[PDB]
Here is the input.
Amino acid sequence: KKYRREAYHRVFVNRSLAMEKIKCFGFNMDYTLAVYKSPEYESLGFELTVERLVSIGYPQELLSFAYDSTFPTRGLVFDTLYGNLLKVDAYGNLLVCAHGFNFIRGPETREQYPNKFIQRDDTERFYILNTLFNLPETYLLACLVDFFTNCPRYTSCETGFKDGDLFMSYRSMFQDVRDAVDWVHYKGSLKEKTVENLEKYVVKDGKLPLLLSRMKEVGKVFLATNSDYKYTDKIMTYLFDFPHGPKPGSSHRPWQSYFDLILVDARKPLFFGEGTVLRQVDTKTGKLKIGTYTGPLQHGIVYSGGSSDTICDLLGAKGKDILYIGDHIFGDILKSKKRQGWRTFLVIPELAQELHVWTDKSSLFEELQSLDIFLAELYKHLDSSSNERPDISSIQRRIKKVTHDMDMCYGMMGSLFRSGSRQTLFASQVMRYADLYAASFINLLYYPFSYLFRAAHVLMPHESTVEHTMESPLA
Amino acid sequence: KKYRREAYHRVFVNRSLAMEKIKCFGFNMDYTLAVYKSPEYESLGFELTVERLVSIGYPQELLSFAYDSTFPTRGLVFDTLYGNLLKVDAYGNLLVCAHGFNFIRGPETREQYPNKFIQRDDTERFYILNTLFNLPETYLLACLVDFFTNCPRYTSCETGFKDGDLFMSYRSMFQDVRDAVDWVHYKGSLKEKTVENLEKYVVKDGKLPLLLSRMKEVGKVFLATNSDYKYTDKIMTYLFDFPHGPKPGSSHRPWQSYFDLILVDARKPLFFGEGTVLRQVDTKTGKLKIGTYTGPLQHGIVYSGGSSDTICDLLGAKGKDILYIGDHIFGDILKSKKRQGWRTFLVIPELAQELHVWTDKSSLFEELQSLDIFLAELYKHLDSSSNERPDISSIQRRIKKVTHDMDMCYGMMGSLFRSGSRQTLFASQVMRYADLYAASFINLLYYPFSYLFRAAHVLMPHESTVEHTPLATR
Amino acid sequence: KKYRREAYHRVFVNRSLAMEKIKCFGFNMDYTLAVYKSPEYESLGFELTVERLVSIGYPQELLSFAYDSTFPTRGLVFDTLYGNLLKVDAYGNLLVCAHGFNFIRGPETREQYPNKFIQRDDTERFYILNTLFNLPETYLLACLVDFFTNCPRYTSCETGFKDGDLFMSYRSMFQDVRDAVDWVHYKGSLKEKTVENLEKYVVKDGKLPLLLSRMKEVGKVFLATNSDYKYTDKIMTYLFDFPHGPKPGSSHRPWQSYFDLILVDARKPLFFGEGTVLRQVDTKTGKLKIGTYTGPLQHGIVYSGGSSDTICDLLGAKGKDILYIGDHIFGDILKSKKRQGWRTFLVIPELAQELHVWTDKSSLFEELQSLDIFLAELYKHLDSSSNERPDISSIQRRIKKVTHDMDMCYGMMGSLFRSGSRQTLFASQVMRYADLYAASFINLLYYPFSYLFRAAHVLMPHESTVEHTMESPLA
Amino acid sequence: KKYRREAYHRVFVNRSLAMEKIKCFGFNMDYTLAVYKSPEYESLGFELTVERLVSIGYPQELLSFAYDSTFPTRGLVFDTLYGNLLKVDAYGNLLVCAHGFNFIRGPETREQYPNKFIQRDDTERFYILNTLFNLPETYLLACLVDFFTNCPRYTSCETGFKDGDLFMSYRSMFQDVRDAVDWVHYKGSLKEKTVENLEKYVVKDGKLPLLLSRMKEVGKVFLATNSDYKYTDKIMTYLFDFPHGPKPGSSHRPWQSYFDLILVDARKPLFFGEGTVLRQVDTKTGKLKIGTYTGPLQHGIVYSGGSSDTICDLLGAKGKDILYIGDHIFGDILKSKKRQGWRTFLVIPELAQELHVWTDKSSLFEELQSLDIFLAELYKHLDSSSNERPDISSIQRRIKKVTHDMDMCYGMMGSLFRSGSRQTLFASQVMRYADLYAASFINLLYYPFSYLFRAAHVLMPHESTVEHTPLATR
Ligand SMILES: [Mg+2]
Ligand SMILES: [Mg+2]
Ligand SMILES: [Mg+2]
Ligand SMILES: [Mg+2]
Here is the structure.
């Protein structure tokens, strides 16, 4: 039995990585350093989207919607043609299909998805609700479908609803939701009401300055956020407001002092390709300077826009010397660039409450391995030369009821990573994108900066189920 | 603790499937029912390929190439620009790079692959050697690159070789190979020289009729082959040449009696699309009837062309009622069609010899496992508080040396499924396409037709490494 | 001698077009139906951009800039690396190169453009000021380069200016201008001050309702603008405010009655590809309805967003039955679409004042054809067997001075279509994009709707200079 | 009213150029100094190409193809997907579409080209037959398409032809043609069979030495050829075989005496890039010296490889001081390099025979011109006020019939420069690349080296159709 950190502190390794060769730690801000509290933050976002939808003309019944965190799972696929929330596997196959709040079973899925299959490439048809900000709109969409479906004033249709002489399609409707969320995030009052009560909305943890401290003793540390500087200063100042610096008794110091480079208005994902013009920010006003200091790496400066390359020049680093910590899954379309890629630490908040299910619901996992063992015993001496057709309909039904019992410990749309046997599309892009992942980057605090992160083998069927311990010539 | 059949007998399960709901069993012919022997069939293909390249104008020194089955591994990617054979992962990442027979260590790869990544979505540059018929040209490609790179009279360049004034691009060369193979399969003598010594080139097992007789007992059985009839009828005849039928003591019967439906000239994968026009075959002349028997089905008939939907109408079955046994992996583009798709049994010959390494080298698997444990012990009481660098350099080189030895027990280009901690593009295409897999379809013989095939869970780093026993919690 | 309409009324034909086969006339609004008066509109745009640049920190001397229409020619290329306005030919060759207000001659161009050549594909380096709205920023850029170049406070550099410890590059500076223009057009007060005094800014012509009238007697007529509906209603109402309808004595009627389809918020050029969702507009509020009427072509409706295809369905038309009148040159990247392309009428306002030069400055054209004739006479009997090297330096100098005398009748950056011998890049895309062109679409008023628009041959050197009236076997 | 030389003697001017500033004259060899005779050299190439395709495996009926110089026109685009030869305009637009020898009228083109447009920026689909060496395969391509489409034993498809079971894509076929040509030029017998009857295949004119002797008098003259030396030295020798030197009565002298610099094996267009390594050639053995004479220049030397910049250093001249005479059009990608580029003289053989139509068919040009006038008269007093449809249908069909007759005076695929009111992709590539053009470089003989070459204005619809005599004015 090999030693492993306690489960809640671990950094999970998809591809091996020698920490010693890391010269730079980069940081996302939103949902990486600034972990927005849950359900509270989603409920805020949700409410501001409903109100904005009502002001543009939506029916007042929407004001009755209250966000329910137990419904959405991140990563779902909205089908703007059929108004369905879909949980797909890595290869496009349906796992969960719910219309509004109505969960469709296998046989009925074949009416609209005759081969239980969607074409995820059809960017026109489907929208992947991949991001922690997409959480409220995921519930909102089910709500609106559930509402209009059950409200007498409207007639339900394959692709939407009839409202007298009018027709709101699930696709027209989805765009309203999408635009409203954009409006809430940009011209709206989300960042306003967030800053006006940070205790309510943003987690504060005092190990965060400690961790960034030791990072800077052994490497360079930078920040590259998409939010403007006025919003960053407010959120970063609160994350560092303690009556002491990194360790207690020591003097507090500004948050800018924990970074060798600070960049705002990055404009990710375009940041990683050509970029934008590299600007510098007057920190007094939070407004761009007209000129821009170009030269060596001196501090006090806050850069705006730019590109991933620009960061690499200023820090004096090759790509693979940069570990980049964040909450987003940047597509494999930037990996193509002949530039050296950044290493990756992906933050997946869900991980915490799912590692809980995994350790506290062990009774259900055991009941599954029992029926599985028992089922293999009923066939132990059966082959193609066997008449016998055992009765396994009730034990097949029990396996059906216990995985669903297990599926529901995660939420109404199940685990983020799997549904029963199959891995979800989301876990597929986690494995493709992320060298390292965990629930918070703060888990880096429990590993020496000399650590060797040796990845685990993702075993194939013939690899997990046969141990290392005359043949037909067809083999 | 649970029961599993002998490792070499097992059908391995990717997605679950209940056999009692299987009503039709369909069969590929080449490399499925007719397992071609190895290395002999590769060598014959390789030698007819080289003859053809020499017939076209290539230097005589090629006649001295002989196949070496220990080099090639299925699934490699030839970079026509820089003339390399690559082993890529599922997401485009270089695992192994060899120019000719010269293996390129990580640092060097950064010259041509600065980011150790290829856009496998670039068919004008890369050609994925996916098929069992691609092993010879995988090696032939490496032979030629090594030859033209070490032959005194040719000069090496980034993208090909100078023959004096004249310049041959690895891409131009690859087309010559790629067409020479096409020629050997389609216009040359391969199919001909195979029939004339079938006992050298084709495996024969009496378990095959036995297994197909028990299928016809509980369902309909069909054959959907890309080969023509003159060839199919020769190869199948041999496969059924025993002085007895299915069980021993029993009168032998014709191979055609084992299939409720026989279709040749399928033009798969166009078969699964619009297809071609359904044609009936004159069993005698080995050629086409002017008409076709549409409507109902009756035995004695041999179809040509058609589509996968034609088979579903004639067999009277829905898509998921069909289990299709074969050796090719048809991409995800044929699933999209609003038809109900077939359940799949993929045949992976390599599996037999790869299941030997996994069991007969349990000494390297256990050495690596001990090295990992010892590594965990050296960092047990370390965190970001401590700033000590334990010396892992000895441990590390030993790891890299044992996994390369484990890698070489598979062959010169590693295991068909993985290279180290990383899965190949092949393995990922296998788990995308295949419901069930095994070294031969014959393994179905060891299972009842009432069997419940329950998928193996493909665990994640945070599921395989943790027991069931506020910046994160939000 | 063939008959031709008087020069100011003509529609110029690049590719032949049978008007009889046109079932639909489509319309741009901004700078097509709403011709913004010049210099007045450019001066407005220019002033609002300067003020916005000053509020973000530009030096107050800018408030002294006054727009001068005699400087810019549409279609120039800004080089964000060297801060130069460039007038290029179809193939990338320099014609005019001015830095600020300083016009560089041949030999000095080879310092920065050693082969008198730019790579127009380098979208990062160069910006093509192709559009009638880009006019103010074209002068503004020369101004800012001229300013900072000559102001003691700044030091001039190859790629910008030093301002103490700072460095404003011509590329950083260009982005400020570009963003400011965007700001003026969108969140700014351009559309506000335009609507608040339409007599000042938008031409009113009473033949415009007459022309749209006869169009609708013989075909369907539609409008597809990028401006929102509140702005369209204001501009279209003024264009149609006369105390009478199409012909005088007749009753005035609304502008919406001149159209079979009205579409706003098109989002060209994306309009011509996949598009956006097709919405419908509540004309009372100028705000989108929640649902959208789908069905046959009934009137009173005003559609929003959509796609070129959507228009084709509703009008019942194939692509080549649609003549589309506008002021923009849509790239050849939408021509690719397997969709049938629209026919094109390109509006080029400049055409009016340039056809003026062509007819009023005939004395200069004649002086050129004289020196040209005279020059060919000095060589009449000269061949490779000739010692004689005539003296043509003063007549070469006169040709240099008269084309420049001619070049300047167009403006400080010369004609829009040519500079001396060479055609400009702009005329190249005019010929590629436009089936028909003229100074206003209103010239359609002088052609019957049965007219055959037979295009003119663009003659090659060996075609214009040899008439229809023993050889070396090398030919 | 102004003076112009005889139409067949003229250098035509695209951009202006003053000859007295020309210090170096450079020469291409094949199709420039060595004008290959027509149709004979096309036929020889065509026949060796077909022999090679039959040697490889193509049906014997090909041996009955014979070249027809009246079909092909340079600049056509072969669509490998649908097997068509296309004549496109400058912006990608179909002017003429022929499948085999079947010409496709507008309406039919809309099946395969719904928008009568091709993305010529798609080299995997289209191949632009730009060069004088491409005429044979232009016709060969059409021959094969027509053959396989009308041969009883082959079946036609959208994208190729079935040979029974086996399927050949027009794209696969095109590679066979394209390489068979490559073979004939590079490994076969073309260069060989040309030397053995030079008086059949290569034009000879005594004006050539005369013209090159007057260049060496007022500037430096060099030769930069892609051919090797054994070939260049054979072809040039013949070009200078007269019982006298430049003027008559004067001692003949060697061809090498006419060039201050001779460079073979140029590998143009890589020549204009980084290039290859500069090599000296042993004049005797026809092979390479182990060294190279770097530094200064002296006569007697023959260079190999190098780059365009090497020539500028050795000749001691800047780019715009060089006028480069040749028959190829090197794309806009070589101009971008921050070097000073060469002034260009493009040689367009076709020009001679096309300047005959323009002058000897002045009857159709005048009929069309009258039809246009009459058309203008029928709409003179019409505006959008009048709603009368005059009958133009008679006039219109006559126009379409006379321009097709004017089109056919050029050949079966129209004029090399235009089709009707529209310029070809060829013409636009000519006015992009070429400073001066003419049917042969020989025409320079008819001009002083002090001459001012003044560009012809390429007028626009609003410049050619209007004399110098408020919705628009803003
Ligand atoms: Mg984020
Ligand atoms: Mg097969
Ligand atoms: Mg406009
Ligand atoms: Mg040549």
Observations:
- The interface with chain C takes residues 56-58, 124, 161, 163, 165-169, 171-172, 175-176, 274, 276-277, 279, 287-294 of chain A (CB under 8 Å).
- Chain A has two domains: 1-36+202-475, 37-201.
- The CA atoms of residues 298 and 466 of chain A lie 58 Å apart.
- Residues 37-201 of chain A form one domain.
